[PDB]
Design an enzyme around this catalytic site. Structure first.
Site, PDB file in Angstrom:
ATOM      1  CB  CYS A   1      -2.492   1.639   6.104  1.00  0.00           C
ATOM      2  SG  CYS A   1      -2.551   0.746   4.485  1.00  0.00           S
TER       3      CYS A   1
ATOM      4  CB  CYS B   1      -6.001   0.844   4.729  1.00  0.00           C
ATOM      5  SG  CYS B   1      -5.593   1.422   3.060  1.00  0.00           S
TER       6      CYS B   1
ATOM      7  CD  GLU C   1      -1.836   5.376   2.460  1.00  0.00           C
ATOM      8  OE1 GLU C   1      -1.683   4.141   2.554  1.00  0.00           O
ATOM      9  OE2 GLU C   1      -2.822   5.896   1.900  1.00  0.00           O
TER      10      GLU C   1
ATOM     11  CG  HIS D   1      -2.239  -0.721   0.892  1.00  0.00           C
ATOM     12  ND1 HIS D   1      -3.349  -0.012   0.500  1.00  0.00           N
ATOM     13  CD2 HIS D   1      -2.606  -2.024   0.890  1.00  0.00           C
ATOM     14  CE1 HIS D   1      -4.344  -0.842   0.262  1.00  0.00           C
ATOM     15  NE2 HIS D   1      -3.925  -2.072   0.506  1.00  0.00           N
TER      16      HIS D   1
END
Ligand code: ZN
Ligand code: ZN
Ligand code: ZN
Ligand code: ZN
Lengths: 133, 140, 177, 177, 133, 140, 133, 140, 177, 133, 140, 177
Positions: free
Chosen positions: L87, L84, L55, L53
């Site tokens: 995340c 997320c 970040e 992902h």
């Protein structure tokens, strides 16, 4: 009358040693890199329609080329079916065409300074006729 | 000496001997076709463009190919009736040697030999002519 | 270089003889090349080429891999277009030199650029053995069951190929006479 | 996936039966697969595989492209090593299920890891039809003239393969008994 | 006794429609990109030896997979030669296995919102037996 | 209702009908081999690991494959002598349905049908069970 | 005296719209393929040293090219720093050089038959000077 | 009419108007350098090869570039002393139009305008001249 | 296009001023380009180029990404070779046109092809502002601590660069006079 | 209570020698191929979130791995900022973790049998702390 | 001897000496944060999952990392109040050695040393245990 | 790994705060990271990340290239979505360990999956220094003139961002209280 007639001294060869030359140089370029500075330019970067593929080898100051012909004219000894080779060393728009017995000695000045896996690409191994001898 | 000693290489260098062993030449063209039709196809191909002509050395796998200059040198019928003369210069092993020869237009069996060219041997170069004798004379 | 077969959504995109087919520069062919080596059994070759133009890409494969002396070859193309006027100027010289090839372009569509450069270009191709025809319902289904991933599902015609045949055939006897 | 042939500088690098050959993890095979479709003529297949291990890469090509019912197949491998003890645990189950394949590993070299895991692993492979042998001078030249870009130059032996045969053959009757 | 027996409801199919599924999804991934977000992971990224290739399709929140089997067991109707398919939608380590008649309706929720060149990859076209009917 | 109405989908959803048309099952294994030897190979394969077993639906191209869990559920011989019972749960169309059936060890022709599973139907999930009815109930 | 003087009508432009032309055509070639038949040949396939990169677009029968110049001469309106463009349609060795206001109408004959993500590469958007107006 | 009506396009087509708005031309060369030295650099560049010269249209982002033919048309000093005349033909929008103009060698501020060329307008082509009117006249 | 730095095993392979260095056709440079935007703070650029020749690959990056009017630039190359006699014929015309660049090739090695074509080629490069020098121990360590992944380990000299300096410097006043 | 605690003996190192390890192994894999059989698998083929990239080196019978950690915990000597390495030789699901002073002697058994351009990738050169000594 | 002589390698092999130089251990965690808060963060991290803990060797760049087993071994507070004991086995240089030590929960400065493990030293392997002495004993 | 900027046809495709934006799984961010090295001048970093992902792809670049002790960092993200819920479970532990980073997600759109897993996931991210806000007209044009190939043409707003601000802001004080 008509145009002039640009000559190149073309050594006619078989079908098979061409397709072991295209497999040794492609061996010694990509997966083994003993002599990796050989720019094998492809088909449609040429103006002469009877050219298969040049092998531009930059040899120090200027480039030696080894080009492959196809569908020229049929030969005398029952295998020379229109596919040949003309080695040519050019020096900044000054072209000469050289002995095969000296050309392998001329790669020898740069490649290489030393049952072999595999043998080095030597043009004398290419241009020897398997039918006259 | 720079021009007279590669003049002397024609005296000495045995690959110029092997090229110039006074040997026969032959138009190996449409060989699968019968013998009579191909002299027409040879004669049709000689003076127009858009085609090549071959000349084998009759003993070796050496040949002479006359590509059109769009891809001194002449192919002509006007020398004798029913016979074509051939002449073309080249730069073989760095030196200017001219190739010339005759070929019987009916048999397609002739004779050709290259002799060293002296006229435009002043038109060679100054130092990059010797660049092949930075390789020929200069071995290493 | 010889692609073996083709999915039918490009078979219909290229080998349909209509007036929708002017919107690209690509060409296709299907060969069926039958070697006859003397004192040896008859083998076969088969495949499809695409794009260097396509019908010269046949010859660079032809003169470099398969070819051998003392043979006789029955080459049978199946082309979308005709060969291009420059392509005829570089394939007709081949079978001029090699007389053992009975090449046969039974193509599907004619060529859109209707000019003088292709008129005798297809004629000068033809005096050497190149029996130019138009492929039909006997040959479209022969291309279907030998070159197409056809699901082992029977041939789907488009109704109108029999009369797209004749008015495209009539543009061959127009140039051949 | 089936590579057609091989250049001879890797033929000698892999298919020589000596004690220099312990210094890599790669394997090679040459098959010669003869279909027998019933009420149809006998065709042929032929090629070389390399590296997923190699003799399973045969089977993923085998069970996904060529295979068809109501047939009989005479598969004939020609392997550098033996099949690996895990590889025998995934090829012997294949011809257990398919009884129409007369597979035959007439290999060249045995396996360096001499342990119990390969002893019955080559035995459990063998009760199904897998006639394990060692290839010899009849078969090295058969691999030479069918799988090697051999210049159309005759076969070069290395003197000692006849007695590298027997002492490597004797390590098969050691495990098969 | 011994281990348990992980089930997956595998629809056995032919050899040929597998090799038109592998040519439509590879069509609609690389050269045409109508549905380009389908991560077709290759052979040896799996632990089950009877897996050819998963087709991980991330469908919004979580991934639907469509995997291909080879060399399972021979079928009943004289072509089912051990090659099958089991569609499976997993949600963050919660696995379910779905109807083929609903799965193509489940790609339909994302792909696509609209003689076709080419038809869209529909699993119902895959899993229909050409021998029972 | 969240468990009783997909209980009611077994009453209604016709793909659960087509799965559960009380239909026969058959071990299609080593079919090219003769009929007597394969019941040994079936019996050898049932209780050891490292192998799979198939169960065709005898009318369709549907099959049940029992992979080992290294790649509730049982394959056993201990129920009756000369007969094996089969039972395994699965999650089909999002819901927990268990498949069970018998197969004659000598004929390799049997009968099997899946019934809806109510016991670990409390062990489904809370909201990500309904995530398939963010697709099944929620069509779009 | 000396040689002749081959002219090409070069529209001088900025540095920045060149580097948004090289990002829209590279968008509409590789990752999006709305007009994918545009052979963008690279630097050293040219003989004129003041050529950055031709954009060979085969437009039906013959190719239109759009080439990019760098380091010609400094312009009049304080940004034209030696980088320009000369659109040129050649027909089998017959060259013409065309209006930018008609060239985008000439891609329009083939591309395309129809806030846009992204806008189509139009040369009229390129060649408009941001300093005179 | 095929030559007289694109002669009439110079009468009518307003991009030939915008090119030929009798407008000034200026050598914008070494502009960061001071004003006196650049007329030397202009005069050094005009009659030798290996260099280009620019001519802006003084109102637009249009320029005329004289590349050497190794990469009718003349750049010369021999017309008048201390002044250079310029003339070159081109094929603009498919038609042969010649560009000519004068430029003051001391001010580097001049005047130039292109007029339609009638002499080698017979040397156009036969049908592939009209290939741009398979696009200009033939819009779609 | 601007490579940021370089590992030291190619720093010694290229930027050592010896007589072993004749056996390739590749060239390297390190720039240190200082913008001076008027009424704005001084920024910096820095990086290494390699191979189209290298010192023209600077200019295609220079005239296409960074360049902007009303500026003054202090470009400072650090080249293995000299610029090539054709390369001088295409870089000297650049700073002829742009007078705001104070380019400075303080190179390391001279050029092996000792001929007339490079004699005035380095001279004709020099009357525009291109202060050609030879880099020394003040500058080799400046190339070390600004372009080399140097382990944050101090500079390793080779003993003899101080007297490889002068006899290579003397080949500049030979051509500049 | 809670789960167990899988240990790996992680040698914490700097930021910089990691990014000269990732440049020597990537040197001795692709462009030079002295030891080309080292499968450097990438980031998201792992289950442990603190793994940068394993270096799977198949060493004859079984694979030695060398993995790279990031963002573990800050060290004692003012540079050990959470990035470390744990060399580990596994044998068909039997894992051991080895001395760095012996691991370079263990690559030495296969690589290689012999101011160097470049030096060979030795893990002892990696794991030496530049702050304690 | 196969277990008693790598028992004797702890007597002899000096990398087992360097590991077991009776040396101090220290939790180097949130070191930029002040000294009092981090013992809370240490105590919060010890008995929950989803986190790691470090133990430096206080003289070297060696550390011990306790990853959760989802990515014998215990981290616990129940031994003494306000002090945590640590113990975990590993397979270092092919042999099963267990690492154990204490750490002061208030100072975060403790003591730890690994001793050779004899109990599951029967649970090693048969021949692939010796596979590292196809490399350790077998040097080449 | 840090992409420098972005073309505006994906700026509008991702950074518009509407209800059309539910139809993909990709995320974007723009950082503005200001180093403060003690007894040294303040430098700057700037760039855009995309997809591992996005970040987290910041942090693998962050902890492996730029990071250095005795520093203070002012990281300022500009994210399309929120981070997320997994995340947040791997970025909040980072600035727990490193207290010199004043990270600030002034994001643009909230997260579509409205559930409990993101409610405290954005809260547990926030007690460490992560000042979560919503970017507005002061910051959309700051993203425009620092991250977008904006033709050096002024900012184009879409009318409605001021009242897409507040009703998306109100979903932050809903979860933060
Ligand atoms: Zn063609
Ligand atoms: Zn194997
Ligand atoms: Zn250069
Ligand atoms: Zn994310």
């Amino acid at each position: 009358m008509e145009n002039r007639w640009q000559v190149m001294i073309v050594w006619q060869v078989d079908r098979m040693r061409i397709n072991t030359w295209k497999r040794l140089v492609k061996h010694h370029m990509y997966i083994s890199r003993k002599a990796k500075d050989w720019f094998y330019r492809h088909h449609y970067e040429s103006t002469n329609p009877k050219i298969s593929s040049e092998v531009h080898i930059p040899l120090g100051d200027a480039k030696l080329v080894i080009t492959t012909y196809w569908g020229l004219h049929t030969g005398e000894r029952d295998w020379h079916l229109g596919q040949g080779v003309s080695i040519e060393w050019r020096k900044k728009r000054y072209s000469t065409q050289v002995d095969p017995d000296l050309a392998d000695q001329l790669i020898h000045l740069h490649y290489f300074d030393e049952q072999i896996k595999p043998p080095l690409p030597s043009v004398r191994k290419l241009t020897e006729d398997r039918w006259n001898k | 000496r720079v021009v007279p000693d590669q003049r002397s290489k024609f005296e000495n260098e045995e690959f110029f001997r092997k090229l110039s062993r006074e040997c026969e030449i032959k138009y190996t063209g449409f060989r699968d076709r019968p013998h009579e039709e191909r002299q027409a196809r040879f004669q049709n191909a000689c003076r127009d463009g858009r085609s090549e002509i071959a000349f084998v050395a009759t003993g070796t796998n050496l040949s002479l190919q006359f590509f059109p200059a769009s891809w001194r040198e002449y192919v002509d019928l006007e020398r004798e009736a029913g016979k074509v003369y051939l002449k073309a210069p080249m730069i073989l092993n760095g030196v200017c040697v001219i190739w010339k020869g005759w070929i019987d237009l009916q048999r397609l069996d002739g004779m050709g030999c290259l002799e060293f060219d002296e006229e435009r041997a002043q038109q060679e170069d100054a130092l990059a002519q010797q660049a092949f004798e930075e390789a020929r004379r200069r071995t290493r | 270089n010889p692609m073996e077969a083709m999915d039918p959504h490009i078979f219909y995109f290229h080998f349909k003889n209509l007036r929708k087919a002017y919107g690209r520069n690509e060409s296709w062919l299907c060969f069926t090349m039958e070697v006859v080596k003397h004192h040896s059994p008859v083998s076969w070759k088969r495949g499809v080429f695409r794009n260097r133009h396509a019908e010269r890409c046949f010859l660079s494969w032809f003169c470099d891999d398969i070819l051998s002396p003392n043979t006789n070859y029955e080459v049978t193309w199946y082309t979308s277009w005709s060969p291009c006027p420059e392509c005829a100027g570089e394939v007709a010289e081949f079978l001029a030199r090699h007389s053992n090839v009975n090449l046969t372009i039974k193509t599907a569509r004619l060529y859109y650029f209707k000019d003088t450069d292709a008129a005798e270009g297809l004629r000068s191709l033809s005096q050497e053995g190149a029996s130019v025809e138009i492929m039909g319902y006997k040959d479209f289904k022969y291309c279907w069951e030998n070159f197409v991933y056809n699901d082992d599902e029977p041939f789907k015609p488009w109704d109108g190929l029999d009369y797209n045949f004749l008015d495209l055939d009539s543009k061959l006897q127009e140039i051949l006479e």
